Amino acid sequence: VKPNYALKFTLAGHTKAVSSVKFSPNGEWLASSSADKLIKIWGAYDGKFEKTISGHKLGISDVAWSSDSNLLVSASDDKTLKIWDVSSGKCLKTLKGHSNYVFCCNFNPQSNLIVSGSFDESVRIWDVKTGKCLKTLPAHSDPVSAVHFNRDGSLIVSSSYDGLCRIWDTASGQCLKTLDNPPVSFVKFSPNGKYILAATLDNTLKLWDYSKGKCLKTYTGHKNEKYCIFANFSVTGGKWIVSGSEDNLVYIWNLQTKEIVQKLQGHTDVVISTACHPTENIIASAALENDKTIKLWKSDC
Ligand SMILES: CC(=O)NCCCCc1nc(CO)c[nH]1
Ligand SMILES: [Cl-]
- In which domain, by residue range, is 31 found? 1-301
Q: What is the 3-state secondary structure (H, E, C) of the chain?
A: CCCCCEEEEEECCCCCCEEEEEECCCCCEEEEEECCCCEEEEECCCCCEEEEECCCCCCEEEEEECCCCCEEEEEECCCCEEEEECCCCEEEEEECCCCCCEEEEEECCCCCEEEEEECCCCEEEEECCCCCEEEEECCCCCCEEEEEECCCCCEEEEEECCCCEEEEECCCCCEEEECCCCCEEEEEECCCCCEEEEEECCCEEEEEECCCCEEEEEECCCCCCCCCCCEEEECCCCCEEEECCCCCCEEEEECCCCCEEEEECCCCCCEEEEEECCCCCEEEEEECCCCCCEEEEECCC
d(CA 233, CA 227): 19
Q: How far is the CA of 230 from the centre of ligand 1 (A)?
A: 8
d(CA 169, CA 264): 38
Amino acid in the structure at residue 42: W
Amino acid in the structure at residue 247: D
User: Quick check: 11 and 21 in contact, CB under 8 A?
Assistant: no
Q: 150: closest CA among 113, 106, 123, 189?
A: 189
Resolution (in Å) of the shown entry?
1.7
Q: How far is the CA of 272 from the centre of ligand 1 (A)?
A: 7
Amino acid in the structure at residue 104: C
d(CA 16, CA 39): 12
Q: Report the CATH number that the domain containing residue 268 is assigned in CATH.
A: 2.130.10.10
What approach was used to elucidate this structure? X-ray
Work out how many domains the chain is built from and give that number: 1
User: Quick check: 133 and 125 in contact, CB under 8 A?
Assistant: yes
Q: 159: closest CA among 181, 180, 132, 190?
A: 181
Pairing mode, strands 231-234 and 214-219: unpaired
Q: How far is the CA of 277 from the centre of ligand 2 (A)?
A: 7
Please identify every residue whose CB atom is under 5 Å from ligand 2, which is an ion. 232, 275-276
Amino acid in the structure at residue 65: W
